[PDB]
């Protein structure tokens, strides 16, 4: 009662000892002990008394008390299952509680039914419209009616009731009877340790009833969920058949059933691998497992042939005619029969069968794998060290290894090291290498199992004829004195004693050996564990999932054969004399002798034991007993390294392109070939099969040599059948491993800190894994609703601390609307619902509060009987709160009940522990007044002008008190250890009551959220009409946190919500949506299970993108890194004041007490970190497996080809929302193709518009000065500047093994790019035959033409459509002369670069090699001079030698040789031999760049009707030509193909918005080139006050026709010009029908994204019929960015009208132009095009004219833009335009005027410093905008160099200040001392506007 209720789900095994002990303590009608009973009876139990009462009850109560032979009266504890299933207590009158439960839940559902359906339907419309389809109806009410008012539930309910009764009885027992339920048809007896059942009688101990209750509730959950239409009748029928049959059999036999169930586990894979393509694997594993089942069945005497045959047939029957995923689910539920009961004897006997069995080892094999361990270690250490290898690595024969050593080759090929023995002998007895010990204070703060001393039995159990220990490693260590992590190790490795007896359960042993064990494992996994090869497990999650899916893919192309080895006994098979090679090697590698093996040694002279049959046995005894054999789970890291070694060896012993993954003992291998690419799949799979068979035979042979009885029980092979950690991978996708997690849908969470809240939490997360794979999302939403409802009911009726007094439970159980309005609001903002909507499509978070109000607005505006609760949330009484509470977590709304008790319990436990300390000065690590200082520092950091909780948390984390709290937080929280802590009773009495009544007070609070409170007037309007969540979230957070800080209102956070912002629309076939920018593609692809060659694309796997934007006398990392990050954040990268830096230094000086005091006036290297979002913490623990699902986010083809951000380094300010948007699109698409599907659905796209944003909220940046001068207190033990070009080339080509900072450049960039590439490759030359010029160019190009990814990034993010490509094609760096291409250019550049260097290499050893320890620069010089001799040599051979000076001597000799044969000036030969140094690339590069920020002319060194037509074809022009559709976008290169180049807009010279009429005059020119008959002039859907007018001005017709898409509300400019001259004298058929009911030309224009068929065919139909109502020619705007569609569109047009001629523009910037184009029936011609999709084109060569004309136009428009940014004109056509159709003057002192504006704005700024809106962002942005307009107006006053500067800046580099330093001309200086930074301070539409304005001005004068 007082604390710590017992558990609810067992984490302890079930034995056969203790249950028998109970049931034979009394007379309840073989065993492993036959000793005595009355001894136990009077042996002080009182359970004898209780069970005497039980037997009295039973005997006197039943009639069959004394009869013949029990034939009426049978007790079957032999696992009755059909009996628990049978009506043991099925009498229909349930306890009135459960009926109330049903009433409440059902009523809540009937209430909230209609609303949630509308919520989901409106969610569907909002995203695309009517999702969640099947190829029938669902509803919440249908969910509950088919989930809970269907059969197979009453049993679960019954056992839940029994479980609760037993729990409460155990509680009462702890407080210090039984319950007797007499009734018709049964009798119930419940004891605190045993329960009885009868109606045919049985007994159940505590753990047993728990197991069976869990089993039943899980089974009910599974079958019930399968009743939902998602994964329907197949699995339902199969699971029910299998359940009935296997339960029957379990009764029929006994424990043996479990074995076949064990075999049934692995059985699925067999049934699953019957892949008809590749044979012999089916008949391998299927047959093996079926025969093994036959054996493990017959072994226990069932029947001979008929029963065996038929029962095996029936156990196989539930697997036929299924798909793989269903089988996987059926597996994960096939484990559903309760963990069997144990018996000590059998387990001890098996592990004895693993005792001595033979010293059969193959010395050659163990030596070979030793050599490979050596080479792996050496290669790895050389890799990361990036210097030399170990101090001594060459003891032995062969000067070739000695060459490898003295030369320091970073590589030792496996092929090589196979050819030798003892590749090194790192074995001595002197010293230590490359490591040290005594660190990582974490481990000892964690406790593991620990056994008793020598005298064990009397301590381990009762029933003797004696002393107990009951100790704990954690208590002992925390209460240990003079502990030294070092001296313990030498005490261990020294003289052993007989005080060590390890026990078996898990395994445990004495304190000192377990301590040294964990120490050694920490050392290994800390230093040596890092060196990993052949396995992708470096990073936590992304690397794992990515590597896995890439393996399963690289199996296939548009060569797959895996096999996997899995079991645990593998670990307990090794022996000493096959480990001491590696043990000794590693031991000597880390110094101290004979350490890494000692376990075996002890196990030599020791015995073990897993309750004991006593005759006489108390000491060393031979044999339920183990005598000195491996081990269950200790030290297994060495096992991992050795498995790595052996897999490498067996691989390289044959031609094996091997790839590996391994966790614990379960591992999976893929092997690959070089199969010829024309043979059918069968042949390729056959070659792969032969290869993996060779590898597998060799692997088995080598393992047996090493000794491993590896069998077919553990090794399964196939072509496409990966497995890893219970997650299977099949033909490039993760299988839907859902239903097992479905079986985790419990009723109450872990008991430690149990509370309603936490319970629902698990629910959500559990349902969340269910959301991830398989089942449709809506079902998951509904299921979460149902589960929270049911669980809230279960907790509100019969609580575990039930109180009859209060009325809160009364008002809850009385109305159902209340529980609904508590289970339908985001739990972060109060309530029991954890992320219904948003998390449904993303694992990320953003801000919970904005997502919470997104949920709330969605529900309300959809209708869930909620409107007034919002205002109540607003005017909610703000909770107590504190500086520190806000501190330790941001995103935090101050509410009373948001910390579950388990947190407070953890805190109290850890603090009580830290109260125990007799250690070294770690005592100071705990002080009582800590939390006061914590809140004090939170105040100091947070009671200022502008305060940010994110930086608050980061600083408080990295500071002095931070790591202190961290240490005191990294303790265990196990029930045992927290119970032991609570055995220190004095926590308090108050908090005791608090935790004792938690859920009650929580429900009382939320009940106080009854019908609305009073709505204050301000907020009433302030929040009404749900405009946008973010402002609501801002106001809510402000109002809530108010009572502490008040006036200040924190911001600087709250990125938006995905579903709130994004609107999007799906498209299939011909779809028209919201008028216009990301998009996802999905071609007509057949799902998994078809044909590898017919998968339309090359299957490319995308991953939830999680990037890490990571770009000196001592440099080794320590707490010094912590202070680095501290200062970097605390300075904000803008706030640089003496106060601020003094304070940062001070917080440092208090933090680092690691070395001596740190007094540096300015920590030099701390770099800027607030310019970015590089602020977070994580990545510490071992694993996190449950990745995700992918079955159609595989053929996905994303592309960011539309503008979202420009040339910039947003650095996770937008990548976060970008990451969310990508994952959200993927989830939308998958959900749209979730269930079993085909290619039946056709090519489909998804276009997400980001335009609909009710608020966007542009970012801001400013400063403040904090001052409250309080501090924590502690002292414990812890000229020309092409250098930018040089560094840029260095970093870039360094990355290949993002155009900012490459914008101010020269061709020297690619010069040095080529230089670095040539340098590296030249060292790789090693004088292989390459003559100077041509062969070096060829080999360079060949080594370049590979590894695309990095080249992709470079191309996209630098060679983009802005001036960079313009400059490039102007300098002839590239060459564009069918190539509709963008990528090849990239590599050409590099090649060109290299080639250019050759020319300088022709004469001159200049270019001053640069490097970013002196041996490094020496070998760099060596590499360079090697390159030089390789080029300009070509007269004599040369030899390799040493690195330091040998090649230098060879160079001097070869120079003296070439003294008589050269090209250069001959003296410079000596000067040929005649090196710059840096610190780190990124810092120096960005610092030097920001040092170029002085007004400079480095840009100087960088310094109408001429379009035409491509007259495609004529009448009957049939001559289909070859498609050559080679196209861009191989992989998703970054967002630059046509995004931004607005400077073109000056060539449409008027000041209006339409500006399209320029195109009008062009097309009218081309029209006048042609004759055209009487006019009707139809302009379909366009003309919006735009072009059309000019046409009549040049071509009048009769009876004009106008259309546009009708919106909420007419052509403007048309009326604005002509009608005076006039008066002088989304839908398919309705709109086109209005047109047909209402000759000459028509005008049409739109655009959408990729869909390989047309969707506006109605308009060609329009033209056909309108000219029918002649040769009236069309005008049709289009573009071949997706040239396929363009060719398809021209072929479709070619239907009727011949002589089609397209004409290009002259105003669109360098970009794929927006060119203007001029059978039997419509659908049949469309079909002609459809079947002409593949090979049908009429543009085989005209592409030549198009593209040379495009480059012409590009040059012309660039020249023209520079002409009009100057004084010249493009007239004789602007006047034709004007016919039809800030004002400030200019002075030289406009710069003085700008100074005036600056001074006035700064005065406003300093003045203001001294729903709502912004503060300094608004005024500063308006200042800059005003300055911009003023400059564009005063343009004509000009120091022209400055005009060129700002020309570039507006051309991407927007608005660097001109008059920087002259802001000098005192108070306006000191009041804001950051004037420089402020002066050092971009939206597309604004850019188009300013370009048009500049053009208007330059035309005006």
Partner 1 sequence: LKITLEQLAKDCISKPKMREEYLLKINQASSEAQLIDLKKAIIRSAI
Does the protein bind partner 1 through residue 680 (CB under 8 A)?
no
Does the protein bind Zn ion through residue 65 (CB under 5 A)?
no
Whole-angstrom Cα distance, residue 1039 to residue 1030?
Answer: 14
Does the protein bind partner 1 through residue 291 (CB under 8 A)?
yes
Whole-angstrom Cα distance, residue 1585 to residue 1581?
Answer: 12
Interface with partner 1 (CB under 8 A), residue from 137, 276, 306, 415:
276
Does the protein bind partner 1 through residue 1476 (CB under 8 A)?
no
Q: Considering only residues 741-770, where is the footprint of Zn ion by CB under 5 A? A: none
Using the minimum distance from each CB to partner 1, give the nearer residue, 712 or 1445.
Answer: 712
Find the helix or strand (DSSP H, E) in which 123 lies.
helix 96-127
Number of residues binding to partner 1, judged by CB under 8 A: 15
1254 binds, among partner 1, Zn ion, none (CB under 5 to 8 A by kind): Zn ion
Min. distance of Cβ 1067 from Zn ion in angstroms? 9
- Per the CB < 8 A criterion, the answer to whether 1081 and 1684 are in contact is no
Using the minimum distance from each CB to partner 1, give the nearer residue, 309 or 496.
Answer: 309
Using the minimum distance from each CB to Zn ion, give the nearer residue, 857 or 1535.
Answer: 857
Min. distance of Cβ 276 from partner 1 in angstroms? 7
Using the minimum distance from each CB to partner 1, give the nearer residue, 314 or 800.
Answer: 314
Please calculate the CA angle 1471-1475-1477 and round it to the nearest 5 degrees.
Answer: 165
- Per the CB < 8 A criterion, the answer to whether 1429 and 1438 are in contact is yes
Does the protein bind partner 1 through residue 1262 (CB under 8 A)?
no
**What are the residues whose beta carbons fall under 8 Å from the beta carbon of 1326, sequence distance 6 or more?**
1440
Min. distance of Cβ 1816 from Zn ion in angstroms? 23
Does the protein bind partner 1 through residue 283 (CB under 8 A)?
yes
Min. distance of Cβ 1076 from Zn ion in angstroms? 4
Does the protein bind Zn ion through residue 1033 (CB under 5 A)?
no
Two tokens at 193? 């340790």
Interface with Zn ion (CB under 5 A), residue from 1252, 1255, 1343, 1808:
1255
Does the protein bind partner 1 through residue 279 (CB under 8 A)?
yes
For Zn ion, which stretch binds (CB under 5 A), given 25-33, 350-358, 1070-1078, 1082-1090?
1070-1078
Residue with nearest beta carbon to Zn ion = 1254
Min. distance of Cβ 1059 from Zn ion in angstroms? 12
Quote the DSSP letter at residue 15. B
- Per the CB < 8 A criterion, the answer to whether 1032 and 853 are in contact is yes
279 binds, among partner 1, Zn ion, none (CB under 5 to 8 A by kind): partner 1
Alpha helix segments (H runs only) across 471-619: 473-478, 487-492, 511-527, 542-554, 580-589, 598-604
**x-or-dash string of contact with partner 1, 236-275, rule CB under 8 A:** --------------------------------------x-
Does the protein bind partner 1 through residue 1099 (CB under 8 A)?
no
Q: What residues are designated binding site for ATP?
A: 1578-1587
Does the protein bind Zn ion through residue 1076 (CB under 5 A)?
yes
Whole-angstrom Cα distance, residue 813 to residue 321?
Answer: 48
Using the minimum distance from each CB to partner 1, give the nearer residue, 274 or 487.
Answer: 274
Interface with partner 1 (CB under 8 A), residue from 219, 220, 286, 1685:
286
Does the protein bind Zn ion through residue 1605 (CB under 5 A)?
no
* DSSP states along 940-956: HHHSSSS--HHHHHHHH
Helix axes 256-272, 282-298, angle to 10 degrees: 170
312 binds, among partner 1, Zn ion, none (CB under 5 to 8 A by kind): partner 1
Min. distance of Cβ 1693 from partner 1 in angstroms? 46
Phi, psi at 799, each rounded to 5°: -65, 160
Does the protein bind partner 1 through residue 1847 (CB under 8 A)?
no
* DSSP states along 1638-1667: ----EEEE------SS-S-THHHHHHHHHH
Min. distance of Cβ 681 from partner 1 in angstroms? 16
Two tokens at 918? 């007799």
Other residues' Cβ atoms within 10 Å of the Cβ of residue 1741: 9
Using the minimum distance from each CB to partner 1, give the nearer residue, 288 or 1697.
Answer: 288
Give the CA distances from residue 1663 to residues 58, 1656, 1666, in Å, rounded to whole numbers and listed in that order. 96, 12, 5
Min. distance of Cβ 1248 from Zn ion in angstroms? 9
For Zn ion, which stretch binds (CB under 5 A), given 291-299, 1095-1103, 1250-1258, 1352-1360?
1250-1258
The closest of 953, 967, 911, 962 to 933, measured between CA atoms, is 962
Cα atoms in the Cβ-side hemisphere of radius 13 Å centred on 855: 24
Min. distance of Cβ 1247 from Zn ion in angstroms? 5
Does the protein bind partner 1 through residue 304 (CB under 8 A)?
no
Phi, psi at 724, each rounded to 5°: -165, 120
For Zn ion, which stretch binds (CB under 5 A), given 727-735, 1249-1257, 1763-1771, 1881-1889?
1249-1257
The closest of 251, 194, 198, 203 to 64, measured between CA atoms, is 198
Place of tokens 């002095």: 960
Does the protein bind Zn ion through residue 1028 (CB under 5 A)?
yes
1476 binds, among Zn ion, partner 1, none (CB under 5 to 8 A by kind): none
What is the CA 540 to chain-centroid distance, rounded? Answer: 10
Q: Is the torsion defined by CA of 1336, 1339, 1341, 1344 positive or negative? A: negative
**What are the residues whose beta carbons fall under 8 Å from the beta carbon of 1298, sequence distance 6 or more?**
1353, 1354, 1357, 1358, 1534
Min. distance of Cβ 685 from partner 1 in angstroms? 14
Does the protein bind partner 1 through residue 282 (CB under 8 A)?
yes
Using the minimum distance from each CB to Zn ion, give the nearer residue, 1076 or 1751.
Answer: 1076
Q: Is 1116 exposed, middle or buried (0-12, 13-18, 19+ CB in 10 A)?
A: exposed
The closest of 1826, 1804, 1827 to 1816, measured between CA atoms, is 1804
For Zn ion, which stretch binds (CB under 5 A), given 469-477, 856-864, 1068-1076, 1853-1861?
1068-1076
Whole-angstrom Cα distance, residue 1425 to residue 1458?
Answer: 14
The closest of 1641, 1774, 1657 to 1707, measured between CA atoms, is 1774
Does the protein bind Zn ion through residue 1252 (CB under 5 A)?
no
Using the minimum distance from each CB to partner 1, give the nearer residue, 274 or 996.
Answer: 274
Interface with Zn ion (CB under 5 A), residue from 1254, 1375, 1781, 1808:
1254
**x-or-dash string of contact with partner 1, 310-349, rule CB under 8 A:** --xx--x---x-----------------------------
β-pair partners for 503? 508
Phi, psi at 249, each rounded to 5°: -70, -40
1028 binds, among Zn ion, partner 1, none (CB under 5 to 8 A by kind): Zn ion
Does the protein bind Zn ion through residue 1295 (CB under 5 A)?
no
For partner 1, which stretch binds (CB under 8 A), given 181-189, 277-285, 815-823, 840-848?
277-285
The closest of 775, 842, 780 to 325, measured between CA atoms, is 775
For partner 1, which stretch binds (CB under 8 A), given 177-185, 281-289, 482-490, 1112-1120?
281-289
Whole-angstrom Cα distance, residue 1212 to residue 1225?
Answer: 19
287 binds, among partner 1, Zn ion, none (CB under 5 to 8 A by kind): partner 1
For partner 1, which stretch binds (CB under 8 A), given 308-316, 1055-1063, 1293-1301, 1694-1702?
308-316
- The residue ranges that bind partner 1 (CB under 8 A) are 274, 276, 279-280, 282-283, 286-287, 290-291, 309, 312-313, 316, 320
Using CB under 5 A, list all residues that contact Zn ion. 1028, 1076, 1254-1255
């Amino acid at each position: 009662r007082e604390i710590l209720l017992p558990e609810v789900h067992l984490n302890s095994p079930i034995v056969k000892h203790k249950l028998y002990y109970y049931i034979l303590l009394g007379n309840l009608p073989g065993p492993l002990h036959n000793q005595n009973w009355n001894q136990i009876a009077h042996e002080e139990s009182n359970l004898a008394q209780r069970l005497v009462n039980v037997r009295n009850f039973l005997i006197t109560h039943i009639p069959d008390l004394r009869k013949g032979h029990w034939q009426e009266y049978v007790n079957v504890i032999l696992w009755p299952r059909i009996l628990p299933l049978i009506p043991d207590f099925k009498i229909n009158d349930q306890l009135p509680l459960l009926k109330n439960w049903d009433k409440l839940v059902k009523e809540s559902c009937s209430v909230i039914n209609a609303g949630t359906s509308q919520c989901i339907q409106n969610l569907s419309y909002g995203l695309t419209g009517r999702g969640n389809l099947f190829t029938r109806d669902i509803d919440l009410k249908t969910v509950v009616a088919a989930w809970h008012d269907s059969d197979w539930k009453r049993i679960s309910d019954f056992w839940i009731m029994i479980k609760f009764q037993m729990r409460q009885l155990i509680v009462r027992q702890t407080d210090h009877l039984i319950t007797y339920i007499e009734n018709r048809e049964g009798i119930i007896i419940i004891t605190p340790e045993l329960v009885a059942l009868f109606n045919t009688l049985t007994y159940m101990t505590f753990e047993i009833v728990l197991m069976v209750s869990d089993m039943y509730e899980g089974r009910h959950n599974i079958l019930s969920l399968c009743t939902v239409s998602t994964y329907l009748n197949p699995l339902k029928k199969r699971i029910t058949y299998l359940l009935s049959l296997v339960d029957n059999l379990a009764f029929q036999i006994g424990d043996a059933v479990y074995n076949i169930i064990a075999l049934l586990e692995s059985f699925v894979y067999a049934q699953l691998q019957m892949s008809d393509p590749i044979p012999e694997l089916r008949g391998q594993f299927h047959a093996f497992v079926c025969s093994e089942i036959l054996d493990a069945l017959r072994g226990t005497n069932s029947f001979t042939q008929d029963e065996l045959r038929t029962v095996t047939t029936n156990l196989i029957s539930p697997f036929q005619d299924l798909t793989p995923d269903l089988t996987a689910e059926l597996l994960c539920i096939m484990r559903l029969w309760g963990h069997p009961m144990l018996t000590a004897s059998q387990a001890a006997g098996k592990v004895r069968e693993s005792m001595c069995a033979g010293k059969v080892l193959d010395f050659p094999t163990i030596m070979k794998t030793l050599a490979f361990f050596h080479t792996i270690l050496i290669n790895g250490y050389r890799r990361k060290h990036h210097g030399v290898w170990p101090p001594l690595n060459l003891p032995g024969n062969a000067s070739k290894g000695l060459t490898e050593l003295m030369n320091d080759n970073t590589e030792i090929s496996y092929e090589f090291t196979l050819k030798h023995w003892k590749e090194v002998s790192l074995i001595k007895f002197k010293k230590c290498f490359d490591a040290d010990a005594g660190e990582e204070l974490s481990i000892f703060m964690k406790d593991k199992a620990i056994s008793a001393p020598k005298q064990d039995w009397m301590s381990v159990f009762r029933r003797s004829l004696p002393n107990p220990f009951n100790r704990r490693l954690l208590l002992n260590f925390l209460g240990d004195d003079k502990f030294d992590p070092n001296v313990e190790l030498q005490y261990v490795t020294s003289g052993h004693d007989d005080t060590f007896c390890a026990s078996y359960s898990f395994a445990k042993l004495t304190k000192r050996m377990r301590s040294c064990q964990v120490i050694a494992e920490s050392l290994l996994a800390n230093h040596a564990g890092k060196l990993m090869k052949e396995n992708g497990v470096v990073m936590n999650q992304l690397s794992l999932t990515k590597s896995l899916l890439t393996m399963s893919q690289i199996g296939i192309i548009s060569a797959a054969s895996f096999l996997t080895t899995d079991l645990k006994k593998y670990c307990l098979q090794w022996r000493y004399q096959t480990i001491i090679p590696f043990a000794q090697s590693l031991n000597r590698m880390y110094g101290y002798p004979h350490l890494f093996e000692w376990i075996h040694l002890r196990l030599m002279r020791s015995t073990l034991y897993v309750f004991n049959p006593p005759a006489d046995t108390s000491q060393f005894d031979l044999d339920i007993f183990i005598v000195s054999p491996g081990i269950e789970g200790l030290c297994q890291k060495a096992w991992t390294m050795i498995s790595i070694a052996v897999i490498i060896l067996s691989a390289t012993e044959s031609g094996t392109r091997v790839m590996s993954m391994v966790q614990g003992d379960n591992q999976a291998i893929a092997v690959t070939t070089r199969v010829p690419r024309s043979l059918p799949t069968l042949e390729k799979k056959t070659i792969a099969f032969r290869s993996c068979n060779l590898f597998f035979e060799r692997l088995k042979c080598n393992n047996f040599g090493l000794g491993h009885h590896l069998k077919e029980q553990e090794t399964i092979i196939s072509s496409h059948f990966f497995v890893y950690s219970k997650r299977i991978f099949y033909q490039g996708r993760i299988l839907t491993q859902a239903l097992k997690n479905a079986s985790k849908l419990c009723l109450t969470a872990d008991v430690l800190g149990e509370c309603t809240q936490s319970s629902c939490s698990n629910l959500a997360t559990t349902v969340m894994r269910l959301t991830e794979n398989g089942v449709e999302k809506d079902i998951c939403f509904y299921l979460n609703i149902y589960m929270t409802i049911k669980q809230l009911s279960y907790d509100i009726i019969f609580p575990q601390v039930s109180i009859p007094g209060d009325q809160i439970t009364l008002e809850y159980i009385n109305n159902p609307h209340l529980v609904s309005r508590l289970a339908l609001l985001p739990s972060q903002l109060g309530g029991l619902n954890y992320l219904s909507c948003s998390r449904l499509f993303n694992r990320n978070i953003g801000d919970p509060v904005v997502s919470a109000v997104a949920d709330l607005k969605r529900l309300i505006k959809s209708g869930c009987m909620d409107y007034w609760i919002l205002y109540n949330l607003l005017g909610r009484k703000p909770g107590n709160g504190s500086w520190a509470t806000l501190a330790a977590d941001p995103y935090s709304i101050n509410i009373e009940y948001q910390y579950p008790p388990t947190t407070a319990l953890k805190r109290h436990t850890q603090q009580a522990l830290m109260e125990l300390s007799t250690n070294p000065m770690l005592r100071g690590i705990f002080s009582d007044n800590a939390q006061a200082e914590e809140n004090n520092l939170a105040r100091f950091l947070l009671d200022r002008e502008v305060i940010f909780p994110r930086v608050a948390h980061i600083i408080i984390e990295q500071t002095s008190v931070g790591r202190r709290k961290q240490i005191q937080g990294y303790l265990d929280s196990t029930r045992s250890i927290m119970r032991k802590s609570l055995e220190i009773k004095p926590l308090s009495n108050r908090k005791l009551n608090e935790i004792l009544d938690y859920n009650i007070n929580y429900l009382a609070y939320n009940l106080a959220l009854l019908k609305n409170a009073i709505e204050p007037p301000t907020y009433l309007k302030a929040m009404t009409l749900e405009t946008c969540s973010i402002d609501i979230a801002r106001n809510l957070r402000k109002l809530s946190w108010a009572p502490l800080l008040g006036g200040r209102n924190l911001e600087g956070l709250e990125t938006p919500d995905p579903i709130e912002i994004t609107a999007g629309a799906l498209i299939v076939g011909s779809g028209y949506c919201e008028q216009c920018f990301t998009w996802f593609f999905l071609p007509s692809g057949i799902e998994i299970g078809g044909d590898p060659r017919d998968n339309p694309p090359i299957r490319v796997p995308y991953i939830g993108s999680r990037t890490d934007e990571r770009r000196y006398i001592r440099g080794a990392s320590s707490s010094l890194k912590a202070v680095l990050r501290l200062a970097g954040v605390y300075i904000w990268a803008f706030g640089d004041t003496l106060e601020n830096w003094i304070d940062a230094l001070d917080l440092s000086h208090t933090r680092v007490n690691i070395t001596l005091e740190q007094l540096q006036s300015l920590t030099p290297l701390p770099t800027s970190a607030n310019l970015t979002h590089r602020l977070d913490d994580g990545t510490t623990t071992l694993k996190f497996t449950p990745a995700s699902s992918y079955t159609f986010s595989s053929f996905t083809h994303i592309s960011n080809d539309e503008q979202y951000l420009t040339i910039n380094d947003k650095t996770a300010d937008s990548n976060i929302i970008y990451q969310q948007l990508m994952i959200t699109g993927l989830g939308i698409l998958e959900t749209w193709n979730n269930p079993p599907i085909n290619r039946t659905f056709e090519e489909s796209t998804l276009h997400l518009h980001t335009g609909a944003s009710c608020c966007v909220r542009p970012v801001d940046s400013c400063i403040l000065s904090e001052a409250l001068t309080v501090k924590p207190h502690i002292t414990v033990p812890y000229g020309k500047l092409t250098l930018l070009s040089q560094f840029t080339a260095r970093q870039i080509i360094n990355a290949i093994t993002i155009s900012e900072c490459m914008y101010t450049k020269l061709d020297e960039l690619f010069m040095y790019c080529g230089w670095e590439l040539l340098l590296e490759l030249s060292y790789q030359m090693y004088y292989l035959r390459v003559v100077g010029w041509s062969n070096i160019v060829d080999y360079s190009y060949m080594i370049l033409r590979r590894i695309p990814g990095a080249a992709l990034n470079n191309l996209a993010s630098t060679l983009s459509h802005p001036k960079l490509f313009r400059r490039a094609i102007n300098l002839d760096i590239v060459a564009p002369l069918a190539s509709l291409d963008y990528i090849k250019m990239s590599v050409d550049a590099i090649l060109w670069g290299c080639k250019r260097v050759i020319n300088v290499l022709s004469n001159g050893g200049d270019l001053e090699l640069v490097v970013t320890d002196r041996s490094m620069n020496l070998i760099a010089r060596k590499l360079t001079l090697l390159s030089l001799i390789h080029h300009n040599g070509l007269e004599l051979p040369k030899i390799k030698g040493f690195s330091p000076d040998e090649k230098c001597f060879a160079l001097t000799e070869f120079l003296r040789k070439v003294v008589n044969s050269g090209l250069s000036s001959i003296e410079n030969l000596s000067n040929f031999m005649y090196a710059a140094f840096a610190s780190n690339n990124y810092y120096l590069t960005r610092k030097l760049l920001n040092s170029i920020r002085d007004t400079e002319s480095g840009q100087v060194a960088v310094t109408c009707t001429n379009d035409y037509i491509i007259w495609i074809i004529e009448s009957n022009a049939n001559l289909e030509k070859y498609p050559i559709p080679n196209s861009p976008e191989d992989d998703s290169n970054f967002h630059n193909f046509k995004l931004n180049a607005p400077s073109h807009h000056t060539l449409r010279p008027l000041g209006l918005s339409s500006t399209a009429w320029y195109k009008g005059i062009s097309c009218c020119r081309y029209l006048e080139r042609l004759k055209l008959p009487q006019g009707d002039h139809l302009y379909i859907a366009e003309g919006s006050g735009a072009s059309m007018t000019i046409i009549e001005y040049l071509f009048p017709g009769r009876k004009i026709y106008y259309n546009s898409l009708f919106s909420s509300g007419m052509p403007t400019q048309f009326i604005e010009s002509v009608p005076y001259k006039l008066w002088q004298a989304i839908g398919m058929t309705a709109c086109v029908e209005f047109i047909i009911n209402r000759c000459s030309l028509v005008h049409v224009d739109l655009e959408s994204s990729a869909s390989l068929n047309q969707q506006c065919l109605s308009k060609p139909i329009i033209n056909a019929i309108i000219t029918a109502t002649p040769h009236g020619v069309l005008i049709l705007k289009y573009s071949w960015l997706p040239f396929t569609r363009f060719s398809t569109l021209i072929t479709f047009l070619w239907c009727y009208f011949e002589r089609i001629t397209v004409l290009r523009s002259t105003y669109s910037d360098p970009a794929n132009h927006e060119v203007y184009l001029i059978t039997v029936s419509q659908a049949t011609g469309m079909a002609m095009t459809l079947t002409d999709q593949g090979f049908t084109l009429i543009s085989p060569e005209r592409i030549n004219q198009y593209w040379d004309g495009h480059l012409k136009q590009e040059r012309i428009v660039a020249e023209a833009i520079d002409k009009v940014v100057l004084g010249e004109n493009a007239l004789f056509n602007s006047s034709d335009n004007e016919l039809i159709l800030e004002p400030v003057a200019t002075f030289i002192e406009f710069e003085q005027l700008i100074c005036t504006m600056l001074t006035t704005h700064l005065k406003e700024i300093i003045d203001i410093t001294r729903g709502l809106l912004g503060k300094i962002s608004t005024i500063v942005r308006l200042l800059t905008e005003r300055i911009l307009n003023h400059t564009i107006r005063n343009w004509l006053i000009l120091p022209p160099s400055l005009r060129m500067i700002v020309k570039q800046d507006l051309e991407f580099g927007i608005f660097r200040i001109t008059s920087i330093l002259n802001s000098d001309r005192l108070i306006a200086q000191l009041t804001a001392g950051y004037i420089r930074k402020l002066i050092e301070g971009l939206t597309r539409p604004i850019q188009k506007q300013i370009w048009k304005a500049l053009g208007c001005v330059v035309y005006c004068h």
